[PDB]
Amino acid sequence: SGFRKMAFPSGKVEGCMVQVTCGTTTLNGLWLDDVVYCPRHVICTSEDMLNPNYEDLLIRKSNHNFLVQAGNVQLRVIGHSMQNCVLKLKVDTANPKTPKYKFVRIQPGQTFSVLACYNGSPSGVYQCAMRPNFTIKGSFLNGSCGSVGFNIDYDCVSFCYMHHMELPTGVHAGTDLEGNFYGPFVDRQTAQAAGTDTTITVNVLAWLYAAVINGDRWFLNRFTTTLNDFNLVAMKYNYEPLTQDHVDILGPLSAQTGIAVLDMCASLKELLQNGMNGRTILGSALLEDEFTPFDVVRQCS
Amino acid sequence: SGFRKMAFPSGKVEGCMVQVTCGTTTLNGLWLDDVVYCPRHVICTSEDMLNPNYEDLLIRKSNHNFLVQAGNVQLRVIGHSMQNCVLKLKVDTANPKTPKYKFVRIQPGQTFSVLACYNGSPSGVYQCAMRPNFTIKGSFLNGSCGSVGFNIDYDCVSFCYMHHMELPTGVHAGTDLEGNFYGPFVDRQTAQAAGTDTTITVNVLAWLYAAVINGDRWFLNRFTTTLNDFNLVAMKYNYEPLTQDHVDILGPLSAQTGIAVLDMCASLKELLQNGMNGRTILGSALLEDEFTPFDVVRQCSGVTF
Ligand SMILES: O=C(Nc1cncc2c1CNCC2)[C@@H]1CCOc2ccc(Cl)cc21
Ligand SMILES: O=C(Nc1cncc2c1CNCC2)[C@@H]1CCOc2ccc(Cl)cc21
Ligand SMILES: [Cl-]
């Protein structure tokens, strides 16, 4: 019993974190096999950040301009290339702690663990979700760039996020490990803003199923709803539309608890209307949206 | 910016988790140097649990009755002894991944990271606090016994918790690594219950300072209070008393934000007496008490391990 915001054990990723320095800028890199991945903005000064021409700035760098530190050992950079917004530094030593890994680009609503790092040293681990507006509500300070997000279903680390920037509202933007940003963000200090965010409906439903599995039923009701009427109500509270894919994904949890997906949608509609009336659900006074249906099944089973 | 419930990086602990089997029971063990630590109830059948005589049950076991698996490698048990509610299995191989470590017993209100494990394999990491009623609000399923809680102080892992039991309300009970239970619990299948819990006041104040550091100030007010008047309110709302030690510990956060501890107490007093009025603090509609003052400073200043 119990339901916590749970991160994957970070050990496999901790053994990949390195410090990357270029000039006066220091951030984190991810060392996998003989390559260190890091944000390409490590080659910029604060001045270069408004309209950097990364191809032009990079062509001027030599391998010895990149200082990579793995623990108390300097790694020798022997090549470099840019892939989208990520810099790939070829080093002369393969990371002996390289886990079984893959690069995966996630969709909004998906969750992952973040291993926040500073100076190539891990500081903490926490659980995030890719918001519908393509930002993450992380906890990152200056020096955290290059920290990564990942999942470890099985013993294979699926890297899905590399941290690049903090937006004015204090939320975070980054790329997948191929250097493609999530959302319409650019690695420039030009005016950028997070779009209006919405609640991840399918995840709230998953968390309500987690609450039912854990013995909480106070929010259930005798009603059901059509998917279209649910979406008309959902959107008035800034909830994401629930698609037939989301209804299908919730199938297993629905079968396990005996509560049809559209029956749980009717509970959610009532919670949006009424609030919790001084009650909590799984220790929360707000509807939680950073647990996916997959997370709920993994944690409760 | 941002403020998350953050656990310590678990790698140093992951390299210590092993699977311990005794008869039909499989649970987790902690392998440090040449010893595997695990709950002494691993030797009990469900019937033994009703009223166990652990010394009597243990004397009947041989070293070969304990099967210890570290990854895909079987460790050889060469001795066994009990220390309070923990079983210590001497193995013939020292764990080469043994980190710098200590065994520490924490106080209620202290937070720690839990590495939940099943079959000697780490499954997840989460942060929690030792409640004032000595339980933890964990997330544990069957097979999770022997999972451990820890903190990291510089390069040293301080192991503070080993999981043993789930109480009827779904909260958890365990021991320190010397096998002493936190709370008035016993490792026996007999009627036990979590006592009435209270809120960890010093931690709520620390989290209010974290909210201020992160740009949330709506709850601040022009008022201050005395420590005695604050404690009279805190007692009324099932909050733990705030001591001068707690006030001293909050000193740094008080100096950084410009909000004196008793000035923040006046904000808390008003929050208790009037609620949040539809507002949230750091994305929460409840006052969060599972961040210590040290956790707040560590997260808002970026300490690494
Ligand atoms: O945001 C950035 N880094 C950073 C990362 N995470 C947390 C925080 C910060 C900044 N200070 C608050 C906390 C840098 C700074 C300049 O502006 C840009 C613009 C574009 C890019 Cl790709 C990166 C950056
Ligand atoms: O509580 C126990 N273990 C367990 C551990 N964590 C989570 C869960 C469980 C049980 N099923 C729900 C989830 C065992 C079961 C029998 O009763 C006792 C009695 C005493 C002791 Cl020390 C241990 C136990
Ligand atoms: Cl995805």
XYZ file of C-alpha atoms and ligand atoms in Angstrom:
655
model
C 0.000 0.000 0.000
C 0.879 3.666 -0.312
C 1.349 5.782 -3.393
C 4.344 8.000 -3.806
C 5.882 10.085 -6.587
C 8.614 7.573 -7.296
C 11.729 8.034 -9.410
C 13.759 5.267 -11.040
C 16.947 4.350 -9.139
C 19.557 6.777 -10.570
C 22.759 4.709 -10.295
C 22.926 3.752 -13.975
C 22.759 7.443 -14.933
C 25.061 8.700 -12.127
C 27.887 6.644 -13.683
C 27.463 8.640 -16.933
C 27.542 12.201 -15.565
C 30.568 14.278 -16.417
C 31.514 17.977 -16.264
C 32.030 19.824 -19.568
C 33.830 23.151 -19.710
C 34.310 25.404 -22.735
C 35.930 28.718 -21.954
C 34.215 30.281 -18.953
C 31.099 28.031 -19.216
C 30.745 24.853 -17.181
C 27.778 22.455 -17.409
C 26.989 18.691 -17.353
C 27.553 16.076 -20.007
C 26.270 12.525 -20.459
C 29.119 10.070 -21.192
C 27.890 6.964 -23.045
C 30.434 4.684 -24.778
C 33.073 7.122 -26.259
C 30.733 10.127 -26.627
C 29.868 12.940 -24.211
C 26.515 14.586 -25.025
C 25.856 18.123 -23.756
C 23.850 21.272 -24.678
C 25.497 22.998 -27.672
C 25.117 26.342 -25.820
C 28.240 25.371 -23.767
C 30.241 27.060 -26.631
C 28.443 30.404 -26.122
C 29.258 33.331 -23.933
C 26.230 35.157 -22.311
C 26.710 37.768 -25.153
C 26.485 35.108 -27.957
C 23.136 33.926 -26.550
C 20.790 36.383 -28.411
C 21.493 35.206 -31.989
C 24.212 32.530 -31.810
C 25.398 31.028 -35.050
C 26.353 27.663 -33.599
C 27.952 26.331 -36.814
C 30.189 29.416 -36.920
C 31.020 29.332 -33.191
C 31.755 25.571 -33.316
C 34.040 25.627 -36.378
C 36.361 27.961 -34.352
C 36.748 25.436 -31.499
C 39.508 22.871 -31.217
C 39.147 19.546 -29.308
C 41.422 20.954 -26.550
C 38.949 23.843 -25.996
C 36.574 21.207 -24.435
C 37.630 20.090 -20.968
C 35.701 16.999 -19.879
C 36.064 15.783 -16.291
C 34.762 12.370 -15.184
C 35.215 12.277 -11.423
C 38.829 13.287 -10.807
C 39.954 12.160 -14.290
C 40.246 14.432 -17.329
C 38.920 12.779 -20.502
C 40.651 13.609 -23.790
C 38.323 15.084 -26.440
C 39.357 13.684 -29.868
C 36.459 14.921 -32.028
C 33.235 16.903 -31.935
C 30.088 17.322 -33.888
C 26.725 18.956 -33.458
C 23.433 17.149 -33.874
C 20.604 19.687 -33.680
C 20.991 21.418 -30.229
C 23.315 18.806 -28.757
C 27.063 18.758 -28.956
C 28.642 15.306 -29.203
C 32.219 15.203 -27.941
C 34.128 12.112 -28.993
C 36.479 11.088 -26.174
C 39.417 8.603 -26.230
C 37.935 6.440 -23.434
C 34.671 4.506 -23.511
C 32.697 4.863 -20.264
C 33.142 1.521 -18.513
C 29.938 2.250 -16.574
C 27.854 2.710 -19.781
C 24.562 0.968 -19.089
C 22.265 -0.710 -21.633
C 20.581 2.393 -23.090
C 18.417 3.933 -25.801
C 17.350 7.423 -26.796
C 13.579 7.907 -26.801
C 11.596 11.072 -27.624
C 8.579 11.238 -25.335
C 5.107 12.720 -25.810
C 3.427 15.301 -23.512
C 1.929 13.591 -20.480
C 4.812 11.082 -20.280
C 6.783 10.972 -17.019
C 10.488 10.473 -16.356
C 13.066 10.785 -13.602
C 15.470 13.705 -13.601
C 18.930 13.388 -12.100
C 19.772 17.011 -11.309
C 23.564 17.586 -11.569
C 26.038 20.422 -10.977
C 29.677 20.329 -12.100
C 29.174 16.762 -13.322
C 28.077 15.624 -9.843
C 24.573 14.322 -9.133
C 22.682 16.303 -6.526
C 19.236 14.692 -6.469
C 16.610 12.683 -8.264
C 12.996 13.550 -8.854
C 10.042 12.662 -10.970
C 8.802 14.993 -13.805
C 6.197 14.923 -16.571
C 6.483 16.502 -19.987
C 3.711 19.123 -19.695
C 1.169 19.562 -22.538
C 2.917 22.924 -23.256
C 6.249 20.984 -23.721
C 7.906 22.392 -20.619
C 8.797 20.477 -17.432
C 8.218 21.766 -13.912
C 11.712 20.894 -12.748
C 13.985 22.040 -9.980
C 17.078 23.428 -11.620
C 19.593 26.102 -10.684
C 22.472 27.718 -12.653
C 24.900 24.948 -13.679
C 22.173 22.286 -14.083
C 22.258 22.352 -17.933
C 23.048 18.939 -19.351
C 21.207 17.126 -16.488
C 19.093 14.351 -18.005
C 15.663 12.774 -17.733
C 15.186 9.067 -18.184
C 13.124 5.971 -17.576
C 14.499 2.533 -16.668
C 11.782 0.017 -17.467
C 13.792 -3.281 -17.183
C 17.652 -2.669 -16.910
C 17.708 -0.426 -20.070
C 17.964 3.301 -19.538
C 15.808 5.250 -21.980
C 17.183 8.798 -22.015
C 14.410 11.222 -23.012
C 15.449 14.677 -21.876
C 18.511 16.878 -21.579
C 18.101 20.156 -19.722
C 18.900 23.388 -21.582
C 16.949 26.375 -20.268
C 14.714 27.970 -17.682
C 11.821 30.075 -19.013
C 10.679 33.327 -17.285
C 7.892 31.546 -15.352
C 10.454 29.225 -13.702
C 9.562 26.161 -15.817
C 12.129 24.294 -17.899
C 12.822 23.508 -21.529
C 15.131 20.961 -23.077
C 15.719 18.524 -25.850
C 15.629 14.816 -26.497
C 19.124 13.168 -26.747
C 19.102 13.757 -30.527
C 19.104 17.532 -29.683
C 15.557 18.288 -30.828
C 13.779 20.623 -28.456
C 10.477 19.659 -26.917
C 8.068 22.443 -27.864
C 8.649 25.626 -29.839
C 11.750 26.633 -27.903
C 15.141 27.615 -29.198
C 18.526 27.751 -27.520
C 18.604 31.573 -27.802
C 18.119 34.278 -25.115
C 15.430 35.895 -27.326
C 12.021 36.480 -25.690
C 10.361 33.080 -25.109
C 7.425 32.022 -23.003
C 5.670 28.866 -21.941
C 2.254 28.613 -23.614
C -0.837 28.209 -21.366
C -0.542 24.849 -19.700
C -3.276 22.314 -19.214
C -3.870 19.341 -16.926
C -2.986 15.873 -18.214
C -6.431 14.306 -18.066
C -5.424 10.673 -18.763
C -2.895 10.894 -15.869
C -5.478 12.338 -13.450
C -7.764 9.371 -14.338
C -4.852 6.936 -13.803
C -4.199 8.498 -10.372
C -7.940 8.188 -9.490
C -7.666 4.461 -10.384
C -4.526 4.310 -8.111
C -6.653 5.830 -5.319
C -9.384 3.205 -5.855
C -6.734 0.411 -5.837
C -5.427 1.842 -2.555
C -8.945 1.806 -0.963
C -10.263 5.350 -1.579
C -13.738 5.428 -3.195
C -15.407 8.558 -1.750
C -15.245 10.360 -5.121
C -17.057 7.656 -7.099
C -20.626 8.351 -8.220
C -23.588 6.578 -9.860
C -23.088 8.503 -13.129
C -21.381 7.871 -16.415
C -20.687 10.266 -19.322
C -20.145 10.201 -23.050
C -16.513 10.927 -24.139
C -17.660 14.077 -25.963
C -19.611 15.493 -22.973
C -16.612 14.713 -20.729
C -14.299 16.657 -23.091
C -16.694 19.615 -23.232
C -16.650 19.807 -19.442
C -12.804 19.001 -19.196
C -11.847 21.812 -21.496
C -13.680 24.403 -19.348
C -11.254 23.567 -16.490
C -8.192 23.647 -18.798
C -7.931 19.863 -18.927
C -6.458 18.193 -21.999
C -8.924 16.407 -24.260
C -9.276 12.691 -23.509
C -8.950 10.700 -26.727
C -10.116 7.140 -27.517
C -6.373 6.202 -27.245
C -6.417 7.416 -23.634
C -9.635 5.461 -22.947
C -8.004 2.308 -24.439
C -4.802 2.869 -22.366
C -6.935 3.017 -19.184
C -8.544 -0.372 -20.072
C -6.362 -2.499 -17.747
C -6.952 -0.221 -14.682
C -10.656 -0.131 -15.496
C -10.776 -3.989 -15.635
C -8.792 -4.310 -12.387
C -10.959 -1.930 -10.320
C -14.291 -2.723 -12.006
C -14.860 0.999 -12.745
C -15.487 1.732 -16.448
C -13.313 4.544 -17.929
C -16.345 6.761 -18.679
C -17.655 6.042 -15.125
C -14.296 7.331 -13.742
C -14.624 10.326 -16.135
C -17.948 11.129 -14.424
C -16.137 11.110 -11.022
C -13.532 13.480 -12.420
C -16.279 15.792 -13.788
C -17.839 15.877 -10.299
C -14.476 16.562 -8.603
C -13.873 19.472 -11.013
C -17.302 20.845 -10.089
C -17.239 20.269 -6.336
C -13.627 20.255 -5.323
C -12.678 17.814 -2.544
C -14.803 19.265 0.315
C -11.921 19.055 2.813
C -11.016 15.507 1.747
C -7.807 14.225 0.178
C -7.078 11.596 -2.437
C -3.855 9.676 -1.879
C -2.593 12.408 0.455
C -3.277 15.234 -1.996
C -5.785 18.105 -1.868
C -5.312 18.703 -5.657
C -5.842 16.338 -8.596
C -2.447 14.881 -9.471
C -1.484 14.605 -13.130
C 2.157 13.434 -13.080
C 1.435 9.656 -12.860
C 0.774 7.891 -16.154
C -1.420 4.789 -16.477
C 1.843 2.796 -16.895
C 3.300 4.345 -13.645
C 0.171 3.411 -11.703
C 0.272 -0.209 -12.860
C 4.034 -0.474 -12.135
C 3.723 1.036 -8.644
C 0.549 -0.775 -7.587
C 1.632 -4.195 -8.980
C 13.846 27.685 -9.875
C 11.388 24.935 -9.018
C 10.946 22.861 -5.897
C 10.482 19.139 -6.045
C 10.365 16.280 -3.554
C 13.904 15.156 -4.277
C 15.650 11.989 -3.169
C 19.418 11.512 -2.859
C 21.046 9.818 -5.900
C 20.593 6.066 -5.118
C 23.588 4.545 -6.946
C 25.747 3.981 -3.847
C 22.862 2.028 -2.254
C 21.849 0.151 -5.423
C 25.295 -1.529 -5.392
C 24.477 -2.986 -1.932
C 21.049 -4.540 -2.611
C 20.830 -8.305 -2.609
C 18.044 -10.938 -2.511
C 17.758 -13.114 0.599
C 15.722 -16.317 0.570
C 14.963 -18.524 3.571
C 12.581 -21.360 2.809
C 9.554 -19.983 0.984
C 10.261 -16.338 1.961
C 12.173 -13.992 -0.312
C 13.039 -10.427 0.682
C 15.867 -7.859 0.308
C 19.189 -7.625 2.074
C 21.807 -4.883 2.373
C 25.326 -6.171 1.586
C 28.040 -4.035 3.233
C 31.605 -5.409 3.551
C 31.143 -9.198 4.296
C 27.716 -8.914 5.954
C 24.185 -9.002 4.522
C 21.629 -7.270 6.790
C 17.941 -8.176 6.484
C 14.730 -8.319 8.633
C 14.929 -11.196 11.143
C 11.344 -12.184 10.143
C 12.808 -13.747 6.938
C 13.116 -16.994 9.003
C 9.409 -17.068 9.929
C 6.568 -18.950 8.334
C 3.169 -17.121 8.572
C 2.340 -19.348 11.596
C 5.688 -18.468 13.303
C 4.807 -14.771 12.842
C 1.790 -15.161 15.152
C 4.167 -15.489 18.148
C 7.791 -15.953 17.115
C 10.663 -17.038 19.284
C 13.384 -15.802 16.949
C 16.292 -17.320 18.935
C 14.549 -20.720 18.762
C 13.657 -20.385 15.058
C 17.216 -19.230 14.207
C 19.059 -22.010 16.105
C 17.284 -24.503 13.761
C 18.718 -22.813 10.616
C 21.993 -23.664 8.946
C 24.072 -21.208 6.825
C 22.970 -23.087 3.679
C 19.278 -22.365 4.554
C 20.021 -18.700 3.603
C 20.328 -18.206 -0.149
C 21.806 -14.785 -0.938
C 21.851 -13.577 -4.533
C 23.799 -10.474 -5.626
C 22.692 -9.896 -9.222
C 23.231 -13.243 -10.969
C 25.870 -14.398 -8.438
C 25.115 -16.570 -5.400
C 26.946 -15.423 -2.251
C 28.009 -18.090 0.256
C 26.609 -17.568 3.785
C 29.325 -18.599 6.306
C 27.770 -17.354 9.566
C 24.562 -15.862 10.960
C 23.615 -13.829 14.011
C 20.791 -11.601 15.164
C 21.088 -8.024 16.399
C 17.712 -6.875 17.720
C 15.234 -7.288 14.778
C 17.934 -7.587 12.082
C 19.573 -10.754 10.896
C 23.254 -10.436 9.939
C 24.437 -13.008 7.435
C 28.205 -13.277 7.210
C 29.171 -13.986 3.590
C 32.526 -15.182 2.162
C 32.868 -12.156 -0.175
C 33.147 -8.497 0.782
C 30.967 -6.252 -1.403
C 33.438 -4.515 -3.711
C 30.844 -1.753 -4.194
C 30.587 -1.043 -0.417
C 30.459 2.740 -0.145
C 31.727 4.850 2.781
C 28.831 4.331 5.201
C 27.503 4.678 8.716
C 24.430 3.446 10.535
C 22.467 6.329 12.025
C 19.209 6.404 13.905
C 17.103 9.372 12.841
C 14.612 11.434 14.833
C 10.947 11.997 13.884
C 10.717 14.881 11.397
C 13.937 13.813 9.653
C 13.606 12.947 5.981
C 15.385 10.237 4.060
C 15.384 8.527 0.683
C 13.932 5.049 0.322
C 15.206 2.710 -2.360
C 12.246 0.350 -2.800
C 13.467 -3.116 -3.875
C 11.933 -6.436 -4.897
C 13.936 -9.653 -5.269
C 17.134 -7.711 -4.509
C 16.507 -5.391 -7.461
C 15.919 -1.665 -6.943
C 12.604 -0.570 -8.399
C 12.274 3.073 -7.341
C 13.512 5.853 -5.134
C 11.434 8.275 -3.138
C 11.776 10.758 -0.348
C 9.794 10.512 2.884
C 9.887 11.656 6.508
C 9.940 9.719 9.749
C 6.514 10.791 11.040
C 6.144 12.014 14.676
C 4.201 8.704 15.253
C 7.312 6.767 14.036
C 5.714 5.409 10.884
C 6.638 6.350 7.322
C 4.100 6.960 4.578
C 5.935 4.741 2.106
C 4.999 2.890 -1.030
C 5.707 -0.778 -0.454
C 4.248 -4.009 -1.810
C 4.803 -7.682 -0.833
C 8.502 -8.472 -1.277
C 9.689 -4.977 -0.296
C 10.927 -5.980 3.215
C 14.615 -5.240 3.638
C 14.410 -2.118 1.400
C 16.417 0.677 3.027
C 16.264 4.364 3.759
C 19.313 6.572 3.736
C 20.804 10.025 3.493
C 24.112 11.062 1.969
C 26.344 13.402 3.995
C 29.198 14.458 1.641
C 30.503 11.056 0.311
C 29.100 8.904 3.153
C 25.846 6.972 3.029
C 24.038 7.116 6.374
C 21.667 4.155 6.441
C 18.768 4.967 8.750
C 15.873 2.629 7.906
C 15.172 -0.948 6.932
C 11.605 -1.833 5.986
C 9.828 -4.550 7.988
C 6.041 -4.127 8.032
C 2.889 -2.484 6.772
C 0.328 -1.424 9.379
C -3.473 -1.718 8.749
C -3.788 1.941 7.652
C -1.261 1.327 4.836
C 1.622 3.170 6.555
C 4.973 1.499 7.225
C 7.152 0.481 10.116
C 10.790 -0.504 10.224
C 14.008 -0.409 12.125
C 17.329 1.365 12.084
C 20.238 -0.824 10.758
C 20.985 -1.948 14.324
C 17.490 -3.619 14.251
C 15.776 -1.276 16.700
C 12.242 -0.369 15.571
C 11.216 3.176 15.103
C 8.036 3.390 17.163
C 6.380 0.978 19.542
C 6.144 -1.747 16.946
C 7.094 -5.411 17.176
C 7.919 -7.893 14.407
C 4.948 -10.110 15.082
C 1.586 -10.692 13.441
C -0.472 -9.239 16.320
C -2.846 -6.234 16.410
C -0.777 -3.032 15.958
C -1.773 0.445 14.862
C -0.208 3.755 13.939
C -0.839 6.266 16.708
C -2.370 9.695 16.020
C 0.071 11.656 13.933
C 1.033 15.311 14.039
C 2.462 17.769 11.494
C 6.184 18.486 11.524
C 6.101 22.237 12.228
C 9.788 23.052 11.585
C 9.496 21.335 8.174
C 6.344 23.281 7.224
C 8.243 26.508 8.058
C 11.221 25.337 5.949
C 8.859 24.645 3.019
C 7.278 28.123 3.446
C 10.830 29.571 3.168
C 11.333 27.432 0.026
C 8.091 28.928 -1.376
C 9.370 32.460 -0.655
C 12.741 31.633 -2.311
C 10.764 30.421 -5.342
C 8.687 33.617 -5.605
C 5.509 32.819 -3.628
C 4.836 35.510 -0.996
C 1.035 35.807 -0.784
C 0.979 34.222 2.697
C 3.439 36.694 4.223
C 2.028 39.295 6.577
C 3.121 42.271 8.683
C 2.732 40.316 11.933
C 5.065 38.510 14.240
C 4.390 36.211 17.231
C 6.137 34.834 20.297
C 7.328 31.279 20.405
C 4.870 30.574 23.285
C 1.811 32.035 21.470
C 2.827 30.188 18.304
C 3.065 26.877 20.232
C -0.370 27.454 21.790
C -1.767 27.662 18.171
C 0.377 24.835 16.902
C -0.874 22.523 19.746
C -4.482 23.420 18.809
C -3.895 22.275 15.185
C -2.052 18.955 15.914
C 1.283 20.500 14.942
C 4.470 19.489 16.717
C 5.829 22.099 19.185
C 8.457 24.444 17.749
C 11.529 24.598 19.988
C 14.297 27.249 20.159
C 16.480 24.603 18.398
C 14.047 24.639 15.456
C 14.101 28.458 15.428
C 17.949 28.400 15.402
C 18.011 25.769 12.590
C 15.758 28.046 10.471
C 18.193 30.994 11.015
C 19.942 30.758 7.630
C 16.646 30.642 5.628
C 15.366 33.560 7.834
C 18.465 35.622 6.960
C 18.353 34.734 3.222
C 14.693 35.660 2.645
C 14.575 38.576 5.119
C 11.678 36.932 6.971
C 12.402 36.311 10.668
C 11.407 32.831 11.967
C 8.710 34.242 14.283
C 7.475 36.413 11.334
C 7.100 33.171 9.264
C 5.384 31.584 12.328
C 2.792 34.405 12.121
C 2.185 33.474 8.440
C 1.783 29.808 9.475
C -0.525 30.770 12.371
C -2.784 32.681 9.920
C -2.668 29.772 7.376
C -3.798 27.345 10.105
C -6.560 29.617 11.372
C -7.918 30.673 7.953
C -6.806 28.154 5.259
C -5.339 28.993 1.822
C -8.519 30.743 0.474
C -8.372 28.855 -2.821
C -4.649 29.505 -3.266
C -1.697 27.096 -3.475
C 1.895 27.203 -2.200
C 4.518 25.538 -4.419
C 1.708 23.724 -6.256
C 0.139 22.349 -3.073
C -3.227 23.078 -1.379
C -1.902 21.477 1.862
C 1.013 22.573 4.048
C 3.886 20.233 3.176
C 5.942 18.861 6.075
C 8.343 16.388 4.438
C 11.170 18.879 3.642
C 13.586 19.671 6.468
C 15.382 23.042 6.705
C 18.547 21.249 5.459
C 16.638 19.773 2.473
C 15.444 23.266 1.522
C 18.958 24.740 1.744
C 20.424 21.776 -0.140
C 17.856 21.997 -2.975
C 17.806 25.793 -3.282
C 21.706 25.945 -3.172
C 22.599 22.820 -5.277
C 24.651 20.444 -3.052
C 26.169 17.404 -4.922
C 27.322 13.836 -3.987
O 18.155 29.351 -18.892
C 19.357 29.139 -18.790
N 19.873 28.303 -17.871
C 19.393 27.919 -16.600
C 19.028 26.575 -16.552
N 18.264 26.040 -15.593
C 17.902 26.833 -14.583
C 18.226 28.170 -14.491
C 18.941 28.748 -15.551
C 19.151 30.241 -15.618
N 19.009 30.899 -14.315
C 17.794 30.451 -13.590
C 17.863 28.975 -13.266
C 20.383 29.811 -19.702
C 20.600 31.230 -19.099
C 20.388 32.325 -20.115
O 19.230 32.128 -20.934
C 19.272 30.956 -21.644
C 18.733 30.991 -22.922
C 18.737 29.843 -23.694
C 19.303 28.692 -23.184
Cl 19.338 27.257 -24.168
C 19.854 28.651 -21.917
C 19.829 29.792 -21.115
O 3.649 -6.391 7.013
C 4.282 -7.257 6.418
N 4.910 -7.027 5.251
C 4.628 -6.173 4.164
C 5.598 -5.186 3.987
N 5.415 -4.085 3.256
C 4.261 -3.970 2.593
C 3.232 -4.891 2.655
C 3.396 -6.003 3.494
C 2.278 -6.998 3.696
N 1.253 -6.931 2.649
C 0.847 -5.544 2.364
C 1.991 -4.728 1.808
C 4.424 -8.681 6.960
C 3.124 -9.430 6.554
C 2.521 -10.186 7.711
O 2.444 -9.395 8.906
C 3.675 -8.977 9.341
C 3.838 -8.876 10.714
C 5.013 -8.358 11.223
C 6.017 -7.994 10.355
Cl 7.498 -7.352 10.996
C 5.878 -8.120 8.985
C 4.683 -8.602 8.454
Cl 5.908 8.758 -24.725
